[PDB]
From a paper:
The Eph (erythropoietin-producing hepatocyte) transmembrane receptor tyrosine kinase superfamily, with its first member identified years ago, contains 14 members in mammals and is the largest among all receptor tyrosine kinase families. However, the cytoplasmic portion of all 14 Eph receptors are highly similar, each containing a membrane-juxtaposing kinase domain, a protein-binding SAM domain immediately followed by a short carboxyl tail PDZ domain-binding motif (PBM). In this study, we performed systematic biochemical and structural studies of the bindings of three SAM domains, two from previously identified Eph-binding proteins (SHIP2 and Odin) and one from a new Eph-binding protein discovered in this study (SAMD5), to the SAM domains from every Eph receptor. Our study reveals that the Eph SAM domains have exquisitely specific target SAM domain-binding properties, although their overall SAM-SAM heterodimer formation modes are very similar.
To elucidate the molecular mechanism governing the specificity of the bindings of SHIP2 SAM and Odin SAM1 to Eph receptors, we determined the crystal structure of the SHIP2 SAM-EphA2 SAM complex and the Odin SAM1-EphA6 SAM complex at the 1.5 Å and 1.3 Å resolutions, respectively. The two complex structures adopt an essentially identical End-Helix/Mid-Loop binding mode, in which positively charged residues from the N-terminal end of α5 (End-Helix) of EphA2/EphA6 bind to negatively charged residues from the loop connecting α2-α4 (Mid-Loop) from SHIP2/Odin, forming the well-known tail-to-head SAM domain heterodimer. A noticeable feature in both complexes is that the backbone methylene of a Gly residue at the beginning of α5 from Eph SAM (Gly954A2/Gly1104A6) is in close contact with an aromatic residue from SHIP2/Odin SAM (Trp1221SHIP2/Phe738Odin). The guanidinium group of Arg958A2 forms hydrogen bond network with Asp1222SHIP2 and His955A2 on one side and with the backbone carbonyl oxygen of Ile917A2. Whereas the rest of Eph SAMs contain a Lys in this position except EphA10, which is an Ala. Based on the structures shown in Figure 2F, replacing Arg958A2 with Lys would eliminate the planar π-system formed by Arg958A2 and the Ile917A2-Lys918A2 peptide bond and thus seriously weaken the binding, even though the positive charge at the site is retained.
Residue numbers in the entry: 1196 to 1256, 906 to 970
The structure:
Amino acid sequence: GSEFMGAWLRAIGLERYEEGLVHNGWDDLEFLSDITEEDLEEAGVQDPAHKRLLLDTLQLSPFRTVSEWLESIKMQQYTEHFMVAGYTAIEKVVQMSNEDIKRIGVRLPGHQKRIAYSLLGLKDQV
C-alpha cells in the first residue's frame, strides 16, 4: 500500500524513491512485483545498484462486472473512465489494448501495467 510501501522502501534504504514511484502509479506493494528495470528508470530510480536491490527484494515475497474487477486491483478510481468509453462488461474489457487503456484516461504507468497484467488473467478465465 502507499504507506506500507514507504516502510518497505525505508527498510532497504530506498525511501528517496517513494515519491517518484507513487507519482508514477507504483503505489501499492501488492502490485509492485511486476515492475521492471525499465519501469524503475522511468520512475526515477537511475542508480543500477538501487534498482537491483529493489528488484532482488521483491523476489523474496470470475467477476460479474467491470466495477467488481477494478475493485479487486484497487483501480476503482477509473470505473467511470471505463464505463463512459464503452468498456462496460467483462467481455469488452478483455479486448482492450495498452493503447485503449491509455486513451480512456489511465495515465500513470503503474496503473496502466496493473490493469494490463490483470486483463491477461481475466481473458484466460473467460
